[PDB]
Ligand binder design. Structure first.
Ligand code: HEM
Ligand code: HEM
Ligand SMILES: [C-]#N
Ligand SMILES: [C-]#N
Lengths: 138, 138
């Protein structure tokens, strides 16, 4: 359907990482920003997920990527509003934001995930964290 | 005990917002950074929590601040590693990171929370989020 055209228009060049999987968890869209970023980080990511091929991403099922794919599968299948969480990707830390997406006829197209790098914030936290616990007890 | 001295030394001037409550949820420490920041944001915060008095913070019980204080109370009481979440504070968005803290004799002193502003990231997410859902269905 032409939902796909509207999507490319609105997101293709926006500043955010954006990716969409269908109801089968098949990647059916990814914007330029996220495409560039996953390109660079491929080797680093491969250390974590040996199967990750950046160039083989469209069409891909994202189960491969998930520790227990059954868990996202359920999660997604019930998502109603936004889900907020974090992931490690290639030793970098991202906040992830997932929302379901629907066509004009309110059918569910799938799920939109948006990744925001927060590696620095996250390392800082780790520091302050151990620094505090070190101080509290020599 | 002198755990308190080591804490002030290590954290008083560090770049992070840091605050510690005891096993009773009484604020027993707050660093300079978080003190300055909560000062500024007091009026904004008061819109959300009418009781919030910035200047009356040491000694304060943080139940007042929590929607169902019973929930953090349980949470904290079982915390073993780090807890990561988010909060609204005075219409600003913060990532929060909570770790238990212990003295030299492994007694539990209480809980250390660290707040990291992510209002901008969070508004961006909201945008991209609705932008996507708008595009997917006119
Ligand atoms: C539309 C695309 C995708 C969606 C909708 C999706 C969905 C999700 C969701 C909902 C979570 C929730 C974590 C939680 O709350 O427990 C998650 C975690 C995670 N995702 Fe994805 N994912 C997608 C693509 C990817 C890709 C491309 C990767 C890696 C290349 C990936 C790797 C991970 C990792 C490492 C986690 C952390 C927990 C785990 O490994 O199971 N995801 N994902
Ligand atoms: C040592 C100090 C504090 C600790 C350890 C503490 C602990 C917590 C924890 C563990 C959560 C978890 C949220 C979740 O996962 O459901 C939370 C949420 C929250 N905290 Fe705190 N808090 C502290 C001080 C404060 C202060 C000073 C405020 C406001 C002035 C505050 C306001 C909130 C708010 C608004 C939430 C969101 C959910 C709710 O309102 O119950 N906290 N807090
Ligand atoms: C998927 N994150
Ligand atoms: C409390 N955050």
């Amino acid at each position: 359907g032409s939902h796909m055209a509207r999507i490319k228009s609105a997101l293709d060049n926006v500043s955010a990482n954006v990716m969409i999987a269908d109801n089968d968890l098949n990647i059916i869209y990814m914007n330029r920003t996220v495409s560039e970023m996953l390109g660079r980080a491929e080797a680093d990511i491969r250390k974590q997920l040996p199967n990750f091929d950046a160039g083989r991403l469209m069409g891909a099922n994202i189960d491969v990527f998930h520790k227990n794919p059954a868990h996202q599968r359920h999660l997604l299948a019930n998502l109603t509003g936004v889900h907020k969480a974090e992931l490690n990707l290639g030793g970098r830390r991202f906040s992830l934001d997932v929302v379901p997406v629907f066509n004009d006829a309110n059918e569910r197209l799938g799920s939109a995930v948006q990744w925001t790098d927060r590696t620095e914030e996250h390392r800082a936290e780790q520091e302050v964290s151990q620094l505090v616990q070190a101080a509290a007890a020599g």
